[PDB]
Amino acid sequence: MNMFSSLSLVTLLLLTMPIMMMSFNTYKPSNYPLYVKTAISYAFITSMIPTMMFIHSGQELIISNWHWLTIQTLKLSLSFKMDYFSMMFIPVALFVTWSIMEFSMWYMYSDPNINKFFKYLLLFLITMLILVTANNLFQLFIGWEGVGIMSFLLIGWWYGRADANTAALQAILYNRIGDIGFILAMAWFLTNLNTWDLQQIFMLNPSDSNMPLIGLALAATGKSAQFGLHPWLPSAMEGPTPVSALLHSSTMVVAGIFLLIRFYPLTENNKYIQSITLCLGAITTLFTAMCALTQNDIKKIIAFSTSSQLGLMMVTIGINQPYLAFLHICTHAFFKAMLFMCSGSIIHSLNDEQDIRKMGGLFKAMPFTTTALIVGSLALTGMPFLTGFYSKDLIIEAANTSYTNAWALLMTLIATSFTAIYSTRIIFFALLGQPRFPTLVNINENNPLLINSIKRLLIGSLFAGYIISNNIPPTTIPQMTMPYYLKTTALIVTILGFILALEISNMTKNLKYHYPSNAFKFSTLLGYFPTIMHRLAPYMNLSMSQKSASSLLDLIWLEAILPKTISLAQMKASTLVTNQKGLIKLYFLSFLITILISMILFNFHE
Amino acid sequence: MLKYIIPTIMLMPLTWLSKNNMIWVNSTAHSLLISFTSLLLMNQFGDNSLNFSLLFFSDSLSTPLLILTMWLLPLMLMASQHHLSKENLTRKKLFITMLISLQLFLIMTFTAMELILFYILFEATLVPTLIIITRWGNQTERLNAGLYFLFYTLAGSLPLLVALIYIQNTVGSLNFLMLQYWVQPVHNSWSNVFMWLACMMAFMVKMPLYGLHLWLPKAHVEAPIAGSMVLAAVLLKLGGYGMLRITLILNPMTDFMAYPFIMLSLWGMIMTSSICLRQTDLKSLIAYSSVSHMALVIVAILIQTPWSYMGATALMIAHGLTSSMLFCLANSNYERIHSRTMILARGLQTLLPLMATWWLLASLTNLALPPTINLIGELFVVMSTFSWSNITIILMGVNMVITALYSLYMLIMTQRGKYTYHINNISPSFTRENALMSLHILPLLLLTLNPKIILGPLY
Amino acid sequence: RWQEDPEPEDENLYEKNPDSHGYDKDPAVDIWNMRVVFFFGFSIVLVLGSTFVAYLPDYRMQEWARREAERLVKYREAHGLPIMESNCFDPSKIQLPE
């Protein structure tokens, strides 16, 4: 308890020390990026000790060290839940962040603000670890919005670029809409359970949890970028590639799914929530994978893959398998961060070229990047016994053996096939064929920072899934009996995707011109959702803001009905009173009228 | 309270007897020492307020407001001394005198134990504020702004005076301690409907209430920087403080009299947040932000629950430091480009890096980023309003979305993008300006560590 | 028209005093103004004032209440009494209407 509790806090304290040094001018800014990277590597080592203790005996504890505030009967303490989800996510997140940070030393070498970049990456990580170990909802909210703000700051890294500022504000906007559900859940739990603590919520176990869980789902819809609040994640590609790798594997996008996992004691009993998340996940995974089929920006293809993988996780929540969903978070972190670092390696070597149509012939020119890309692609598609297979395969065969929506199951299976198609697109168009890039060749992947960072995540994309699966305790009843055609479904549809993708890819080399189909434009333009919503909604809101709220009401009608009317009457009355002829005859004639009406009408004389 | 009233008065002889080149140094140094001793007011008890004499008392509601008031006077002096540099020496001393006299009326207003004494001091703040706006504002419209400020307040204050005197005639006392024990319920009648309105309309105009807010965009924009700092930070809180006290004697009639004003606020904040999205004047944008935030305070005071009173108290303190910092930030730009137009100077983060950090920190506190006390207050109010009616989560949630959009829109438009080519007098930020920014944000962020001292009497 | 002075030119404090702190034109007054703001603002009010607040003696007696509650819970559970009764005031001292 003393070592477990002590070591699980140094990890969090260790990560803040570079922040304290920077903010307190006590550092040698010579190689601050190396300092930050070194601290992350040491945090990973210290985080393994608590995890090994959990692996050994399932030891878990809650630390409520600091009493912050008591609001009548709601005591709020700084608390950390060191449980199954915390003890496995933290070492994975640190290990992936260790590679991303070493990679970013090479990738952001030329940046004049690289020191600030590494500080922001570290804050991004600290806010995610606050989120993942939070024991009460208020502490969770701190990390929930912390990653949201760091995301805003990093996506808009190149702040001279109008597109980077639009994309950054878009991320805040979509995540703030999701945060309405978070605030809703907090208010319901406080009102109905008198707690924001996760322990009291589960002990009381509310039966009518429709409203709190709908709020939690809405929060997850925004953070995890599910259909409806999805467009911001592809737009987040405006950021430097290291941001995309970290924002897509760890940190932001996984927080939405993690929030629903943390509340599985509630959702596991509420069928109506399971149906909603299942259908929300199924439309997301299908729709975004469909979008990736025709993208030409390499970062956007990988970005839409993350959206489709997060949709798959929501489906797993929707079929009451929170632990499989968590496993997919952990395995996904490895090969998705590797894929982004591989694309960054290609983009850097081709002078910031991101269109796959201007790549080609890089299979032999960039051998190590090629190997990592193929390993990352095979892991993504569920190649047997790579890291991806140990989560994705169990999810698919747990979904076709469940009591489940048939459309959601069928849509999920098609998305698995689409996963093999857009994966083949990247390999075919980036690596194969003849080079299509400019004539001054500058390819070079020989920096040790680049090689070592990818090499560690390559070892992770091969064995990490096998290691984790064989060390985590069982918490369900794995359903291992099924017909052959349900067992091998994921494997088969994946193979069909590769074959169909290859034929489609090879037909681009024929000398035939074909007019675009309606479905091709629908996929390419993202179902027209950003084209319509991001013009219509801003226009209606912004026009109302000016025409009605500001002009009609504030500058006219609220002026007209009070100050302008009152003051106009006073002016008119003044002119009536003071416009007189100065004639003695008229004033004294008015005296006689006053005396008469004073007696005849008002009887002032009686 | 004489240990704060007397030294605050002694600031006036200090300023008038100073050497001509030390008026700012001396007044700023000694107003900071007064600010230091104000921390002795935090000797608060769980059950009893701190009752000094027959005239003045302090409780957990007035104590944080007093500490904010005495802290702002030093900050208003530093903010002012640049644009008054060319001013005639005696007119500089008079300007400082108005600020000191405003502080004197404020610290007595927040501690007066009798409501009619509160009324007289509540009203006495009009005079120095009006003089500051009209004498030392820059534009032609400052004269009209003073008139709107004066008559919007007085139109509500005069009915309050009649109501208070009527309450004293019938109850026999206006001492607030007595009113806690001698209070009787208010039964329905047209007579009591108008007693309620006369007791609440003066405070609603000061907040301001949506519909009665037109004076504030004019006054908060035409005023000199010091005038805007006090108007936003403190004077708006006389309305909130007054409501928090007088609602004691209005029950249970507040049950149904609150409905028209809760509706004006819930819808008002969404209307005034949306206005900020299309504002062309940076100071005007900030002013309309204050209306949106103070709408929550009005709702929290009216629904009258233990959580909403804690949230209202936190919001009033947090808004005071944030809104004051934003006006000061916008003033620093204005002192360089001599225009309030927001789109005029862009990409300023490229030319003024550190000052862009203050812009970010000010913006984050404005959009209520947790665990800032801005979020703490705004969250407590949302928790209690949800219980009042669950559907209010929709309006609170929408306002939180819109507030982030205009908070970051102001940050993006002024600090990011490309710098305006023809603006070539953006000198580096002065030490005075950097210190003035950090004296808002640092205390604001420190209070997160110990938020119980700004949660009011119901903590 | 009329006889009026033209608008005076803008004065950049850094041209005469590159080390300007932005307080005063006089370099000696300018340094003193910065000193009082920093010492009395940061060193005194913020640092000592924060220390004062942290060591406030049991602000609003929340710590005494926790100690008192523990004493009551211990006494009530030992003697078999209810932890908390629904009635705040003893009903023998109350005379209901009707």
Binding site: - | N138 | W2, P8
Partner: peptide, 19 residues
């Protein structure tokens, strides 16, 4: 700029027989 002060046009608002 500098602080606005009333000019002749403004001042003649108050120079007539009536307001």
């Amino acid at each position: 700029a500098r602080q606005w002060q009333p000019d002749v046009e403004w001042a003649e608002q108050y120079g007539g027989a009536v307001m």
